[PDB]
Subunit: 387 residues, 4 copies
Amino acid sequence: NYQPTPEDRFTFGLWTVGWQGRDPFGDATRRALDPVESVRRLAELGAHGVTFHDDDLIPFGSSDSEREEHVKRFRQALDDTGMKVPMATTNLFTHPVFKDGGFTANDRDVRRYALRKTIRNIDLAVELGAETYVAWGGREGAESGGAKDVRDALDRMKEAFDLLGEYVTSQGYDIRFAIEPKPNEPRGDILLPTVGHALAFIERLERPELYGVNPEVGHEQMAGLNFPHGIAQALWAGKLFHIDLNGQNGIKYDQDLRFGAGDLRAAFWLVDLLESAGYSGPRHFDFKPPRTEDFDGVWASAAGCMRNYLILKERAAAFRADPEVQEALRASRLDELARPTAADGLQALLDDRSAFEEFDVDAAAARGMAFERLDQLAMDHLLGARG
Amino acid sequence: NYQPTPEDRFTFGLWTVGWQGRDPFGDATRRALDPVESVRRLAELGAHGVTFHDDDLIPFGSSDSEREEHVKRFRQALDDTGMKVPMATTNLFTHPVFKDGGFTANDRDVRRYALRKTIRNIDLAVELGAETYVAWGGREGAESGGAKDVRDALDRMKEAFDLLGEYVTSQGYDIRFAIEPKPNEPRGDILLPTVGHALAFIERLERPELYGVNPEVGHEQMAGLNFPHGIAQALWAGKLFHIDLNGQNGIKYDQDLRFGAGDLRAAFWLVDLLESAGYSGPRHFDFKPPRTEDFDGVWASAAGCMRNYLILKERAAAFRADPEVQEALRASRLDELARPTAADGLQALLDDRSAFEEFDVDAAAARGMAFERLDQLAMDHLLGARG
Amino acid sequence: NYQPTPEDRFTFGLWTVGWQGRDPFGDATRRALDPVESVRRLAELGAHGVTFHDDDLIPFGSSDSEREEHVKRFRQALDDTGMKVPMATTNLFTHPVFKDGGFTANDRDVRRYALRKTIRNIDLAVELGAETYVAWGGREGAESGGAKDVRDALDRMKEAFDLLGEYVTSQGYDIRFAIEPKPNEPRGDILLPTVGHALAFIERLERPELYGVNPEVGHEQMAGLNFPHGIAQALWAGKLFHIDLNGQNGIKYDQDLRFGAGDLRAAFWLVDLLESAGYSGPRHFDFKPPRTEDFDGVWASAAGCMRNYLILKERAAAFRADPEVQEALRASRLDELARPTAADGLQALLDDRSAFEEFDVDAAAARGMAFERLDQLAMDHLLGARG
Amino acid sequence: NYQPTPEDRFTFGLWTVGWQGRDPFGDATRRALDPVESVRRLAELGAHGVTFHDDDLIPFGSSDSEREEHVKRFRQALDDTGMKVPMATTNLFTHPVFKDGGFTANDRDVRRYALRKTIRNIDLAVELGAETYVAWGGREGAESGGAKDVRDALDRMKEAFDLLGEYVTSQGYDIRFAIEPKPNEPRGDILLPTVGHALAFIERLERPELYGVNPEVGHEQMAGLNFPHGIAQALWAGKLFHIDLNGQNGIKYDQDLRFGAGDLRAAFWLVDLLESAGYSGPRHFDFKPPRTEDFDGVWASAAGCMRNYLILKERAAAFRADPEVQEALRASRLDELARPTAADGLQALLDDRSAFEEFDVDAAAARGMAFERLDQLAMDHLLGARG
Ligand SMILES: OC[C@H]1O[C@H](O)[C@H](O)[C@@H](O)[C@@H]1O
Ligand SMILES: OC[C@H]1O[C@H](O)[C@H](O)[C@@H](O)[C@@H]1O
Ligand SMILES: OC[C@H]1O[C@H](O)[C@H](O)[C@@H](O)[C@@H]1O
Ligand SMILES: OC[C@H]1O[C@H](O)[C@H](O)[C@@H](O)[C@@H]1O
Ligand SMILES: [Mn+2]
Ligand SMILES: [Mn+2]
Ligand SMILES: [Mn+2]
Ligand SMILES: [Mn+2]
Ligand SMILES: [Mn+2]
Ligand SMILES: [Mn+2]
Ligand SMILES: [Mn+2]
Ligand SMILES: [Mn+2]
C-alpha cells in the first residue's frame, strides 16, 4: 500500500512542513515548528532526510552559542531518527538587505555580504553531510527595464559562482552546486528563469563540472514549459544533481502543491523518466501544505507527496513492462528514434539516393505515428484501467 | 520622420508579407505574391533585404529548370533593387512527411531526408550571399509523453547539427547556424523551447562556435519570459547571430504582430539593448500582416515595423543621453552593478570584516533603490513627455 | 471494461474526426471523410450522435440539388445506424468574407449575410432533430484597439441573437441557443471570452430563457480558468445547455486533445460535477485527433474520449459513495457550506452576539479544514489506489 | 506638464502607498505609514481622495475609544486637505479565521462573522462619505476540487450580497456595491474570477441595480484577458461603478505595478475608452510601490500613476480628434459597426435578396479592413511621433 521507507530517498525542506501559512494577503495560520519536531515527524512517515536554508536551522542574528545549541539539537534529532541531510542552501531572499538581490544586487557591498553568508553555510552543510548545495536566486532580477543591466548582472552572477567553486576547491570539499531556476516571483522577472537558461549559464563558469541544476516541477510550469522535457534535457547534459518535486496548476503564482497535485499526467511522465534514466539523487519535496490546514493536515500533505510518487512509479513501471506497450512503442518507431540518423557518415548520406532523389515522401507521410493508441495505453496504466 | 533606408539593415521574410492569411480556422484572404514583387515593394519602403525558406523561393517539387528560372528571376530583382539576402532557412514543417519532425522524427528515413533537404538549401543560401542559416524545429516535439523520448531526440538533434557543421566546414563556407526557439505550436511542446534551452544545447555540439540563436520576440513571450533579458543572456554568451522582431500579446498562439505592437515597453527595452550592445546583424521582421488586411494593408504593416524600430531607437538614445537619467542611473547604483564584486580575490573577501562581521545590514537595507523614478524617466522618454 | 453504448449520450462533431490535419504551419495529413463514413464508424464505437456546421454537411456553394443529395445520404446513414443529431451550428469563420466577424463584422452587409446563413441552417437543424443550436463567435473581436468598438460590437451581437430568437419563436421551433466562449484564436481577443462573459451577455437579450452556454474544456483553460468552477457557475444559472469535452495543456493555442488528455484531474472533477448535478445533455466531444495520426489513430482517439469519460465517471461515483470520503466531507464542513448562512434573517444576524461581539475568532481560525486528507482520498480514488 | 489636481478624481487605497513591502518571500522593507501622513502626502501630489479597508483605518482588535480616535484623526486630515473618501471595503482576507473565505467559508459561523464585520464598516463608510462599497472575495475558492462545492458556494455568496443589499435599503443609504474580480491568488482558483463571472452573478441577486463591478487592470490580465474589452462589456451593462488602475506584465502573480507600467498600449486603449464613454467615477489606483523603494520612491511611484493617466488621456484625445484618424475610422467601417444590422426587421431581412441570394461574398471578402494603418496612427499618437 505504497508505504515509503528511507530507502526511497524522500526528503523535505524544513521550510515546507514548517511553512506557517503567511502569504502576501494574510497572516500565519500555524505556529512555527521546531526543526527537531519536523525531523521526528518526517522520520515517522518514512522520509529519508531533510534539507535547510541557513536561516531555517539557525535564526538570523543568532549568537555563536545560540548557533551551536541549534545545531546540537538538530544533530541529536538526526541521530535519534537515522535521518540524513543531503542538501542545504542559503536564504538570500528574506532579509530586506536582499531586496535587489544577493549575488546580483546593484550594491556591491550586498553582493559581498551574500557571498560571505553563503560560504559560512557551505561549511555547515558539509559538516552535516550534505552532497549538494542549492542556489535559488529569487531576488535576482527586476520589475523595470532600467534597474538591472542583465549582462552586468550575469557577470556578477558568474563571479559569485566562480568564487564559490574556488572556495569549495580550496577546502577540498566534495559538495557540488545546483542552480534552481524560477521565472518570476518575487521579482517581476528573475534571472536564469528556466532549466535551459541555467544550463547555458553553467557552461560559462570557470569549473562547469562543479554545477548542475535543481529544477522544480512548479517553476518550469510557471512558464508553461513541459517539466519532463526540461528534466530530460538536464539528464542529457549530465546535470540533474537534485530535484524539487511538487504540483502547480498552470501559469500563476508559485503554488507548491503536494507532489501529484497539479498536473497529474506530467507527474506520471516525470516519474517514468526519473526511474527510466536511473536518477539516483534525493526525491526532494519543496511544497507548502495549504494554509487551510492544521498540523495534522501538514503531515497528511507530506505523506501524500511520497504516496503519489510510489503510486506513479508502480504505474510507470507497469507501462514500460507491458508487452502490449512494448509493441506499441515499436509501432510508433520509438526504437528508430534511438538509432543514429547517419552512422554511415556525411559523405554516405550525401551519396544515398534513398535519402532524397528516390525518397518516397508521400509513402512516408502516409504512415501514421500511432501515438494516440500509445497514449491511451499510458492513460489506462496510470488509472489502473487495463482491460 | 523616421524614414528607413537600407543602411538601417531592415529585412523581411518572404513568408511575412507573402502570408496569404490562412489560419487553422480559415481560408486565405489574399492572393500569393511573386517573391520578385515582394523584393521590389520592400525595397521601395526602405528595406535592406529579404530572407527565405527553400520552399518560399522554389515551390516544393520543382524541376531543375523550374528551380533555375525561379532563382534567376529572384536574382534579377535583387540586382534591380540593391536588396541583399542575409539569411535563409529550410521548410521542415509544412509537408506532411514532417508531421513528427525533421531532424527528430521518429522515422529515421525522414530524419535523413530532412538533412538532405537542408544541405541542398545551404548551397543556395551561400550562392545568394547569406551569412546566417536558421533552423526552426517547429515539428520537433510531442503532444503526448510516450511519443518522444527527449534524450534520444536530443541525440538526434545533436547528430543533425553536427552533420551540418561538418558539411559547411567541408565546403569552406563562412555561413553560420542560428537556432530559433519556440516553446509550443504546432507541436504541443517543442524541443529547445526557449533561448536558454537552445544556448545550453549548443554547448554540447562538436563545433559550438558555428552555432548561435535567432530569438523571436513573440516566442519567448509565449512562455511569459522577458525578451530583453533573453537577448541579454544571448549577447552575454556571444551568440546573438540574428533576431526576429515582431509583437505578441502575452501567452497565447503565435500572433506575429508587426514590431512595436504587442508589448510596447518590451520593444523599447529591446531596442535600447540592441543599440547599447552594438548588435550589428540584420534587423529582421518575422510578422504576419493580419488577415483582415488587403495588399495595401500588407505594405502599411511592414512600413510600421521599421517606423516603430526607428522611433524606439530615437527614444532609447535620448534616454541614455539625458544627464538627468545618467544621474538617476547612478542613484540606483547601475554603475556599481558593473563593478566586480571581489576583484581583491577570495581570501581578501573572507578576511574582509566589512563584508560580514561588521556589515551594517540594516543601513544597507534602508537605502532605496530609486528604481521607480528611473522608470518614470524612461516612460517619459518613450512617450515624448519630458518636462 | 468501460465500453460505451448510445445510452451514454456521447456525440462528436463531423469536424472532429473529420479534421484533415491542416494547421497554420502545415498541410493536411489525412484525406477528407465522407460524413456518412464518420456516422457509421462512430456508431460502431458506441456513439449516440453527431453534430455539424452547415458547411461540414453541405459544401459551401452547393446547388439546391447537391444540398438535397448530401442531406439524403446523411439521413440514410442516421437511419442505418440509429444515430441522432442533437446539436448544429453555423460556419461563420472559414470563408474570407468573415475575416472581421459575422454577427459583429464592421461591414453591415456581412452582418446581414451572417444572419441569413445562420437562419438557413436553423431550419435544417430542426429538420434533423437538433435540440440545441450553437454559436461560436470565433471571428468576433480584434487584433488592435481601434478596429472594434466593443460596446457597438455587443449592440450588434445582441441584435443578431435577438433576431434569431424572434425567428425561432416565429416558426414555433423548440430549439434553443448555446453560446460557446473562447478567449482568443483566431482573433487576437475574441468577444464574450469566457463562460462568465457569455452568461452576463445573455441576461441582456430580449428573451434570455432561449440562450445558454456551450462551454469547452480547453477554451476556459486557455485563460487559465478552472473549468469545473465555470461549469458550476453555468449550472447555478440554469444555463448548461450543451458542453464540449476535450483536453488542453494550459495557456497556449487551442489544442483540442481527446477528452481525458490535458488536465486529467480537472477532467475527474468535471465528470464528478456533471454526474452529481444530473446534467442530462449530450456528452459532446470537440477534439482533433493529432495530425500525426492516420485513420486508425483517428478512431482510437475518438474511442479514448468515451473510455476516459466512463473511467472517470466510475472513479468519481466511488469517491462520493465511499463512507470514508463522506466522513472526510463532514470533517471539512462541506455539509455546512450547503446550509444557509442566515435563514434567521438580517435583524436576527445583527442581534446575534455569537456572530460578532462574542465570536471566538481564534478558535475558529485554529480549526483545520482537513482539505489535504480529503484531496488524497480523491487522488487515491482517481488512481484506483484505495488501501 | 501633466500635473494632476483634485478635479482629475485620482484616488489611492491606504494600503497602496502604505504597503510595507512584505511579500511571500520576504520581510517588510518600509515602516508602516500613519493614514494621516498618507492623506497629506497624497493631497500634496494632487490626489482627490483615498479609500480604505476597515482594518487599514482601525487596527483589528481596537477598542471603541481607540476606534473613535483613529477616525477623528483621519477626519481631521481629510478636513485639513480637502480629500474625499469615495470608496471603502472590508478586510475579509488577512485574519486566519478567513483562511477558507468570508462569505463562502465552509464554516457557517465564519460566514456570519464576515457579514457582521462588513456591515459595521458599511456604516463607517457612509459616515465618511463613500459612494461605493467594494467587495473583493480574495479567500473565496479552493486549492482542491473536493473542498468547495461551487454551486453551494454561489448560494452562500448570493445570500451574503442579498443581506447586504437588505441592510443598506433598511438604513436608506445611497451607497452601492461593486464586486472586484480576481481569478486566482491567494486561493488556487477564486470564485467570480473575471468581470464576466461577476456581471453574470449580479443578475441573480435580489436587487441587481445595487451591484456593479470594480474591475482591476492587472486581475483581468492575470487571465490573459483584454482589459479594455472587459471594461467595455461592463460599460455596456451599465455596471462600471468603480475601477482599479495599475499595471501587470502578463500571466503571473498579481504585480500591482504603477498605472502605465505593464501593458502600456492596453493602458492607452483603457484611457481612450473611459474618456470616450464618459466614465465619471473615481480614477482609483490599486498599486504597490515595489519593495525596492524607500518612501521617496513610494511618492514618486504614486505621482507616476497620475502622470501616466494624464499623458495617455492627452494622446487618446488627440487620436480621436485627428481628422486623419477620423477618415481612417471611416475607411475601416467603424461608423458601420455602430449602425443597426437590421432596423428594417426580421421579415425584411429574410426577404432581402442582397443579404443572401445575391450577396457578392467575394467582393465583400476582398475589401481590406485597413486596420493596420489605423493602428499605426494610434501608435504614432501614443508615442508623439505624428509626421
Ligand atoms: O533553494 C531552496 C528553496 O528556497 C526557497 O524556499 C524557494 O521558494 C524554493 O523554491 C527553493 O527550492
Ligand atoms: O525559421 C524561419 C521561420 O520559419 C517559420 O516561418 C516560423 O513560423 C518562423 O518563426 C521562423 O522564424
Ligand atoms: O461551434 C462549433 C465549433 O466550431 C469550431 O469548429 C470551433 O473551433 C469549435 O470550438 C466549436 O465548438
Ligand atoms: O478590495 C480592495 C482591495 O483589497 C485587497 O487589497 C486586494 O489585494 C485588492 O486588489 C483590492 O482592490
Ligand atoms: Mn515553488
Ligand atoms: Mn524549490
Ligand atoms: Mn512567431
Ligand atoms: Mn520567427
Ligand atoms: Mn477548442
Ligand atoms: Mn468547441
Ligand atoms: Mn491586484
Ligand atoms: Mn484591486
